[PDB]
Amino acid sequence: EVQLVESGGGLVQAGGFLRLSCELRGSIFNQYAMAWFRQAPGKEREFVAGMGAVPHYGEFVKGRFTISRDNAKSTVYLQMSSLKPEDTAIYFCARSKSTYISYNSNGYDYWGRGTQVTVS
Amino acid sequence: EVQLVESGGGLVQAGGFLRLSCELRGSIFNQYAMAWFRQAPGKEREFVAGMGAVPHYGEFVKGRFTISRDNAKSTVYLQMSSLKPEDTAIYFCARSKSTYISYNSNGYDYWGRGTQVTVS
Amino acid sequence: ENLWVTVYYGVPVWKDAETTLFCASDAKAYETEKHNVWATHACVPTDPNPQEIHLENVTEEFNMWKNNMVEQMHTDIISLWDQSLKPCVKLTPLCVTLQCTNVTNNITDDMRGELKNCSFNMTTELRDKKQKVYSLFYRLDVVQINNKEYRLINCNTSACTQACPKVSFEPIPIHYCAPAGFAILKCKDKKFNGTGPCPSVSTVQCTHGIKPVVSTQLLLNGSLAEEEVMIRSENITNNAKNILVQFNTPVQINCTRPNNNTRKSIRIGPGQAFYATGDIIGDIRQAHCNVSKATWNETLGKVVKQLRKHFGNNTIIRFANSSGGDLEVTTHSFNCGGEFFYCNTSGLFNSTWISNNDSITLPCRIKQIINMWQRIGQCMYAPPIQGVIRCVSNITGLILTRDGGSTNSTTETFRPGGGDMRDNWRSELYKYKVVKIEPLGVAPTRCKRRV
Amino acid sequence: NITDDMRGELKNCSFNMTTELRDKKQKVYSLFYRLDVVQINNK
Amino acid sequence: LGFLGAAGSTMGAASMTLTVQARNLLSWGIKQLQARVLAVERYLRDQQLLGIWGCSGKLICCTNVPWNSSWSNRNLSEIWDNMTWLQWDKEISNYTQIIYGLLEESQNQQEKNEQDLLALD
Numbered sequence: 001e002v003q004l005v006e007s008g009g010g011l012v013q014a015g016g017f018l019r020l021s022c023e024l025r026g027s028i029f030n031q032y033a034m035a036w037f038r039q040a041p042g043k044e045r046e047f048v049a050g051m052g053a054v055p056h057y058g059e060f061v062k063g064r065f066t067i068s069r070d071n072a073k074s075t076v077y078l079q080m081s082s083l084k085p086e087d088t089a090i091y092f093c094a095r096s097k098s099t100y101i102s103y104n105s106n107g108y109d110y111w112g113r114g115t116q117v118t119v120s
Numbered sequence: 121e122v123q124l125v126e127s128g129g130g131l132v133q134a135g136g137f138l139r140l141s142c143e144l145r146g147s148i149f150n151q152y153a154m155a156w157f158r159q160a161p162g163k164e165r166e167f168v169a170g171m172g173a174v175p176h177y178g179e180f181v182k183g184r185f186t187i188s189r190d191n192a193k194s195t196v197y198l199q200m201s202s203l204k205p206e207d208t209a210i211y212f213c214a215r216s217k218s219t220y221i222s223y224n225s226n227g228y229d230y231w232g233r234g235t236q237v238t239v240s
Numbered sequence: 241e242n243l244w245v246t247v248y249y250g251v252p253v254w255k256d257a258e259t260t261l262f263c264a265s266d267a268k269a270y271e272t273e274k275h276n277v278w279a280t281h282a283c284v285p286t287d288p289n290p291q292e293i294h295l296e297n298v299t300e301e302f303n304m305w306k307n308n309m310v311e312q313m314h315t316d317i318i319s320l321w322d323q324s325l326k327p328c329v330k331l332t333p334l335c336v337t338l339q340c341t342n343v344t345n346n347i348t349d350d351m352r353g354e355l356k357n358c359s360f361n362m363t364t365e366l367r368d369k370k371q372k373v374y375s376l377f378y379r380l381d382v383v384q385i386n387n388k389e390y391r392l393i394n395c396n397t398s399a400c401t402q403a404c405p406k407v408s409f410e411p412i413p414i415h416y417c418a419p420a421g422f423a424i425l426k427c428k429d430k431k432f433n434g435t436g437p438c439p440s441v442s443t444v445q446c447t448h449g450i451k452p453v454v455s456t457q458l459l460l461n462g463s464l465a466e467e468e469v470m471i472r473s474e475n476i477t478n479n480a481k482n483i484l485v486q487f488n489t490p491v492q493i494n495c496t497r498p499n500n501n502t503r504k505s506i507r508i509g510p511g512q513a514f515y516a517t518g519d520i521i522g523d524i525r526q527a528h529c530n531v532s533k534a535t536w537n538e539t540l541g542k543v544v545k546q547l548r549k550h551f552g553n554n555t556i557i558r559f560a561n562s563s564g565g566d567l568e569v570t571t572h573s574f575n576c577g578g579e580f581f582y583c584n585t586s587g588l589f590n591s592t593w594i595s596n597n598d599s600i601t602l603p604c605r606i607k608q609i610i611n612m613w614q615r616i617g618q619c620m621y622a623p624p625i626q627g628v629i630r631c632v633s634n635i636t637g638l639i640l641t642r643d644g645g646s647t648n649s650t651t652e653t654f655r656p657g658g659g660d661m662r663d664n665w666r667s668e669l670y671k672y673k674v675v676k677i678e679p680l681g682v683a684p685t686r687c688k689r690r691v
Numbered sequence: 692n693i694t695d696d697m698r699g700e701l702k703n704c705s706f707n708m709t710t711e712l713r714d715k716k717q718k719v720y721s722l723f724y725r726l727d728v729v730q731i732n733n734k
Numbered sequence: 735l736g737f738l739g740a741a742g743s744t745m746g747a748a749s750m751t752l753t754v755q756a757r758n759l760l761s762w763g764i765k766q767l768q769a770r771v772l773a774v775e776r777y778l779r780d781q782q783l784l785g786i787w788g789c790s791g792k793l794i795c796c797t798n799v800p801w802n803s804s805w806s807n808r809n810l811s812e813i814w815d816n817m818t819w820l821q822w823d824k825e826i827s828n829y830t831q832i833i834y835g836l837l838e839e840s841q842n843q844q845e846k847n848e849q850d851l852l853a854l855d
């Protein structure tokens with residue numbers, strides 16, 4: 001069975017630091033690409049970051065974030081930094097159909113529960 | 121089945137340039153050695169060039185020629201250069217019995233059709 | 241009235257199951273010695289015209305979306321490509337700082353920063369000496385570090401082996417045959433939508449010519465449908481599932497690389513050779529592809545008409561260009577003559593349909609190295625091919641991904657997509673399933689075993 | 692402020708090493724236990 | 735007339751040709767070897783299961799153990815003329831691995847009754 005977990009997140013001061021994680025347990029780790037989606041209240045899902053064979057980021061990341069996948073633990077991290085208050089939203093974790101990343105939400109078939117992140 | 125296919129050759133001006141080739145299709149290329157024999161009119165066959173693990177040349181080559189075998193395409197090339205009129209003859213291609221080259225014609229068991237080369 | 245039980249060995253009955261299949265390759269090419277991927281030198285030779293015998297009064301249900309042969313086939317290709325790269329040569333010595341600059345031999349205005357002329361020191365056959373060789377690398381294979389100081393893009397993630405010149409990447413058909421005790425069914429209904437009972441099912445010991453093709457979208461050289469362009473899906477209501485459109489009449493596509501590339505050999509070490517692009521002869525022209533304007537518009541007409549049976553008749557169906565993301569999903573990466581292409585497709589999926597001669601030209605890009613779909617880590621190096629590469633192919637199907645719009649706003653937008661690399665084969669293994677025979681059944685009759 | 696229990700147990704070693712690029716080199720350091728290093732001939 | 739060439743026909747008519755479905759049952763390189771070992775192994779299992787019963791290779795092994803009307807409750811002539819084997823298997827698929835036990839008991843019990851019968855002479 002394919003299932004995913006997530007890190008804590010939690011409240012973070014404006015301009016602070018935070019790290020997320022997502023462990024892929026069921027399927028093989030070196031045969032799929034993982035990516036993170038955010039869903040602000042009253043808005044649809046959109047791409048944030050994703051690591052296949054080459055990193056990708058959204059238009060609003062502007063290099064603030066950093067994404068890397070540890071092959072040993074079979075997890076993908078997200079070294080977010082300097083979180084503006086507009087970034088508050090629920091950050092999901094999803095696995096792509098294959099080793100490529102597509103910005104549309106319909107390119108993934110195994111989502112996560114969702115991690116709550118807020119900035120004040 | 122073991123068979124060989126030669127190159128064009130054809131008439132070439134004296135002191136010109138030419139290139140011959142011979143592709144071995146049936147047997148394994150990396151367990152046999154090829155060689156080239158010429159038969160001038162009214163004369164017996166004699167050695168010209170051959171490549172096993174170390175190149176060899178005939179007495180009249182005098183370093184003018186150059187022989188090399190491409191393992192990828194399973195073919196042996198022979199770089200003619202400075203063709204004197206006395207070099208006109210039918211240039212055969214033959215496969216040695218095993219991994220070695222002998223200047224006697226009886227050291228080969230699969231001959232080619234014969235390439236005609238003329239110099240004027 | 242008393243009747244007893246009996247057991248009938250060798251009775252025809254089967255149950256769904258899975259197992260491991262094996263070689264079936266044509267013996268015609270055996271004489272042509274080629275130790276390439278998808279090997280024939282190590283196989284059971286195929287059989288001419290296998291025992292394809294029809295069945296009557298039989299009803300069987302197929303389900304390709306949960307088929308096991310496609311999953312089994314995938315692990316086969318993964319385990320094969322790795323085996324074919326072991327004898328090749330690594331590229332660890334090549335990860336060196338490069339001094340590069342633009343190349344301008346009256347280059348065309350279409351591309352300016354596409355070819356970089358790089359020179360770097362390198363070890364010769366004797367380690368005491370070093371040589372200063374030069375080569376041309378595409379702009380997608382070099383990054384700047386700090387001016388002119390570039391390195392190969394893959395020299396900080398994972399080194400990878402050169403593709404052996406001996407092997408070839410062209411598609412060799414691979415038939416699949418079941419082992420003793422098993423049998424492979426084969427549906428034959430023309431109006432077969434992937435799932436559901438197939439009335440005229442027939443058995444066969446071996447599948448037809450199956451050529452696995454490495455493509456992301458617009459899968460090439462597929463098996464044409466008989467009639468009535470089909471739309472095979474899993475949960476068409478859900479938009480997260482792909483839609484493998486397969487049409488009967490193919491549209492021919494011509495792809496060429498007008499650049500007159502010349503190969504140059506450089507010695508890695510003793511017995512290790514590395515090939516690099518030499519000097520481009522003649523003018524430089526962008527690699528492109530062509531598809532007939534008239535046929536393509538008609539082909540989309542069939543797909544749109546056949547797609548309305550699921551979304552009603554008064555629906556404004558309009559196509560849109562690719563999604564946007566990894567370079568191998570935005571374009572379609574198809575192998576052609578040993579070189580990997582990347583062809584922009586925004587010129588095809590651009591139109592809108594209401595329910596009331598010329599040739600399309602598109603650009604393409606080429607990458608010498610590729611992060612192979614087999615695994616995330618290892619890359620690959622594609623040696624250059626001399627002369628001009630041109631290859632024609634049959635575009636037989638499409639891989640469309642629907643857009644998750646609102647229930648209102650009946651304009652439903654489809655987008656080309658893919659990259660799964662399992663759906664490519666699923667379009668070719670949608671007819672077959674593997675079954676296990678279960679002899680020695682039990683039936684009632686009348687006997688008395690004499691003592 | 693190492694404890695008096697052990698003095699010559701952890702050694703702070705630094706050595707040149709090849710980076711991802713074959714041409715360049717980097718000076719990195721690490722700590723090795725006393726049972727993994729021997730003297731040759733000082734430090 | 736071929737391998738599984740009468741699967742959809744009448745079960746009574748399916749018995750006309752039973753050897754074709756049995757003869758063609760026993761006939762990356764590691765994959766081939768594993769399949770062959772599995773293929774031969776499966777055939778041995780089936781033959782052994784027939785061996786423990788009152789037959790070895792007769793190919794029509796009619797046993798004397800009583801039949802149950804509850805298992806099928808279908809008329810004898812009603813099922814042997816129209817219904818096919820595949821449909822028949824599903825009807826009594828649930829009632830499997832129980833008749834097999836009965837057959838073994840009806841054979842081992844009978845075997846000794848024959849052995850001592852030949853000994854009283």
Ligand SMILES: *[C@@H]1O[C@H](CO)[C@@H](O[C@@H]2O[C@H](CO)[C@@H](O[C@@H]3O[C@H](CO)[C@@H](O)[C@H](O[C@H]4O[C@H](CO)[C@@H](O)[C@H](O)[C@@H]4O)[C@@H]3O)[C@H](O)[C@H]2NC(C)=O)[C@H](O)[C@H]1NC(C)=O
Pocket residue numbers: 193408410411453460461574575576577578631632633634
């Ligand atoms: C879909 O099917 C089509 C139909 O086959 C296929 O087109 C084929 O492309 C290959 C590309 O290599 C063609 O093969 C080449 O043809 C040229 C023509 O001049 C030859 O010169 C080539 O020979 C050289 O390269 C070989 C590569 O191994 C060497 O072995 C050889 O010694 C030469 O150096 C080579 O044979 C092939 O002819 C066409 N098929 C045709 C024209 O019918 C297309 O590629 C398929 N689609 C995909 C995505 O592959």
Ligand SMILES: *[C@@H]1O[C@H](CO)[C@@H](O[C@@H]2O[C@H](CO)[C@@H](O[C@@H]3O[C@H](CO[C@H]4O[C@H](CO)[C@@H](O)[C@H](O)[C@@H]4O)[C@@H](O)[C@H](O)[C@@H]3O)[C@H](O)[C@H]2NC(C)=O)[C@H](O)[C@H]1NC(C)=O
Pocket residue numbers: 017018019
């Ligand atoms: C050995 O030394 C380590 C380095 O000092 C010790 O790690 C410390 O562990 C504690 C508790 O586990 C941390 O205290 C927490 O700090 C976070 C803030 O850290 C955030 O940033 C880091 C940066 O990577 C990130 O990893 C975290 O997840 C957080 O996002 C607070 O939010 C918590 O409330 C809590 O106070 C220390 O921060 C951490 N040290 C450092 C330098 O980060 C380790 O505990 C030592 N081992 C033992 C056995 O004591």
Ligand SMILES: *[C@@H]1O[C@H](CO)[C@@H](O[C@@H]2O[C@H](CO)[C@@H](O[C@@H]3O[C@H](CO[C@H]4O[C@H](CO)[C@@H](O)[C@H](O)[C@@H]4O)[C@@H](O)[C@H](O)[C@@H]3O)[C@H](O)[C@H]2NC(C)=O)[C@H](O)[C@H]1NC(C)=O
Pocket residue numbers: 137138139500521627628
């Ligand atoms: C890309 O550039 C290449 C280099 O210019 C082009 O190769 C040219 O190909 C043509 C026809 O195939 C040749 O014209 C022939 O020349 C021979 C004489 O060449 C002899 O010497 C060469 C040296 O190796 C040898 O390979 C030949 O086999 C011959 O032995 C004439 O005899 C013929 O009649 C004919 O004129 C050119 O000579 C050749 N160029 C060079 C520099 O040799 C190639 O065609 C270009 N690609 C495209 C698509 O145009």
Ligand SMILES: *[C@@H]1O[C@H](CO)[C@@H](O[C@@H]2O[C@H](CO)[C@@H](O[C@@H]3O[C@H](CO)[C@@H](O)[C@H](O)[C@@H]3O)[C@H](O)[C@H]2NC(C)=O)[C@H](O)[C@H]1NC(C)=O
Pocket residue numbers: 062063383396397
């Ligand atoms: C292997 O090398 C590549 C190429 O440098 C690394 O990716 C690159 O990493 C750098 C920083 O490590 C990124 O620089 C950043 O770029 C953004 C703009 O995208 C800029 O706003 C930032 O200020 C920063 O300069 C760079 O973007 C990124 N990508 C490319 C194409 O250069 C990669 O991280 C290396 N591998 C490992 C494991 O570190």
Ligand SMILES: *[C@@H]1O[C@H](CO)[C@@H](O[C@@H]2O[C@H](CO)[C@@H](O[C@@H]3O[C@H](CO)[C@@H](O)[C@H](O)[C@@H]3O)[C@H](O)[C@H]2NC(C)=O)[C@H](O)[C@H]1NC(C)=O
Pocket residue numbers: 182183
């Ligand atoms: C690997 O090294 C050997 C040794 O040099 C190469 O064979 C030698 O190649 C040279 C020129 O490449 C030959 O020189 C020629 O010698 C003749 C006399 O035989 C002379 O008349 C010419 O003017 C020229 O100087 C040499 O004969 C030849 N053999 C030996 C024993 O040195 C070999 O080609 C090298 N391998 C590769 C793949 O290049």
Ligand SMILES: *[C@@H]1O[C@H](CO)[C@@H](O[C@@H]2O[C@H](CO)[C@@H](O[C@@H]3O[C@H](CO)[C@@H](O)[C@H](O)[C@@H]3O)[C@H](O)[C@H]2NC(C)=O)[C@H](O)[C@H]1NC(C)=O
Pocket residue numbers: 343357358359374518519520
């Ligand atoms: C990539 O750049 C390197 C150096 O920046 C180029 O190396 C040299 O390029 C010249 C012409 O661009 C080649 O021809 C030379 O021309 C001079 C003109 O006087 C002549 O005197 C020389 O005898 C020679 O013919 C030269 O061969 C080449 N160097 C080598 C070692 O081949 C290189 O050409 C550039 N790449 C391309 C594709 O242009």
Ligand SMILES: *[C@@H]1O[C@H](CO)[C@@H](O[C@@H]2O[C@H](CO)[C@@H](O)[C@H](O)[C@H]2NC(C)=O)[C@H](O)[C@H]1NC(C)=O
Pocket residue numbers: 433434435436437472473474475476
């Ligand atoms: C593929 O065809 C099968 C039957 O040929 C379809 O099966 C039924 O489809 C209807 C709707 O078209 C559903 O209401 C039924 O529940 C389905 N029954 C079964 C047993 O599947 C199937 O829906 C078709 N699928 C697609 C994607 O067109």
Ligand SMILES: *[C@@H]1O[C@H](CO)[C@@H](O[C@@H]2O[C@H](CO)[C@@H](O)[C@H](O)[C@H]2NC(C)=O)[C@H](O)[C@H]1NC(C)=O
Pocket residue numbers: 494495496529530599600601
């Ligand atoms: C693809 O089509 C384009 C036209 O859009 C072709 O480009 C022309 O090809 C002819 C061939 O002789 C040249 O004379 C022209 O100069 C080219 N350009 C234009 C603007 O017409 C291209 O050759 C075609 N390629 C293939 C492989 O079919």
Ligand SMILES: *[C@@H]1O[C@H](CO)[C@@H](O[C@@H]2O[C@H](CO)[C@@H](O)[C@H](O)[C@H]2NC(C)=O)[C@H](O)[C@H]1NC(C)=O
Pocket residue numbers: 492493494530531532599632
């Ligand atoms: C792709 O190339 C093929 C062959 O090079 C073209 O097919 C030929 O088209 C011409 C058009 O005048 C016909 O006269 C020939 O009979 C065709 N031959 C074959 C074998 O098909 C094809 O037209 C090219 N594609 C496009 C879009 O132009």
Ligand SMILES: *[C@@H]1O[C@H](CO)[C@@H](O[C@@H]2O[C@H](CO)[C@@H](O)[C@H](O)[C@H]2NC(C)=O)[C@H](O)[C@H]1NC(C)=O
Pocket residue numbers: 570584585586587
């Ligand atoms: C593929 O080609 C199309 C055009 O054929 C490109 O579309 C361009 O999109 C940008 C984005 O705003 C526009 O500024 C350009 O004007 C468009 N092109 C033209 C000719 O108008 C598309 O960008 C190409 N694909 C990629 C990945 O660049």
Ligand SMILES: *[C@@H]1O[C@H](CO)[C@@H](O[C@@H]2O[C@H](CO)[C@@H](O)[C@H](O)[C@H]2NC(C)=O)[C@H](O)[C@H]1NC(C)=O
Pocket residue numbers: 586587590591
């Ligand atoms: C995609 O389709 C649109 C039409 O829906 C094309 O829009 C036209 O583009 C041409 C070429 O630039 C212009 O001359 C027309 O004026 C455009 N139409 C309108 C109404 O303004 C668009 O060009 C197509 N994309 C590409 C790359 O050709």
Ligand SMILES: *[C@@H]1O[C@H](CO)[C@@H](O)[C@H](O)[C@H]1NC(C)=O
Pocket residue numbers: 296297743
């Ligand atoms: C299929 O059944 C029909 C009637 O049930 C019968 O006439 C026909 O012969 C059967 N098929 C075959 C191949 O015998």
Ligand SMILES: *[C@@H]1O[C@H](CO)[C@@H](O)[C@H](O)[C@H]1NC(C)=O
Pocket residue numbers: 342352353354
């Ligand atoms: C070289 O090409 C780049 C684009 O790839 C361009 O920005 C630059 O001006 C060109 N010239 C030089 C000297 O780099």
Ligand SMILES: *[C@@H]1O[C@H](CO)[C@@H](O)[C@H](O)[C@H]1NC(C)=O
Pocket residue numbers: 337338339359360361
């Ligand atoms: C090769 O080594 C020499 C040694 O001084 C150096 O000057 C030159 O820059 C090196 N080549 C490159 C491309 O860096």
Ligand SMILES: *[C@@H]1O[C@H](CO)[C@@H](O)[C@H](O)[C@H]1NC(C)=O
Pocket residue numbers: 474475477478
């Ligand atoms: C298709 O997806 C929708 C989405 O909610 C779901 O309601 C429906 O049950 C799914 N159908 C199938 C056959 O999976």
Ligand SMILES: *[C@@H]1O[C@H](CO)[C@@H](O)[C@H](O)[C@H]1NC(C)=O
Pocket residue numbers: 345346520521522523
């Ligand atoms: C353009 O560049 C090509 C590339 O070799 C060359 O053959 C040709 O002579 C050049 N023509 C002009 C006008 O510079």
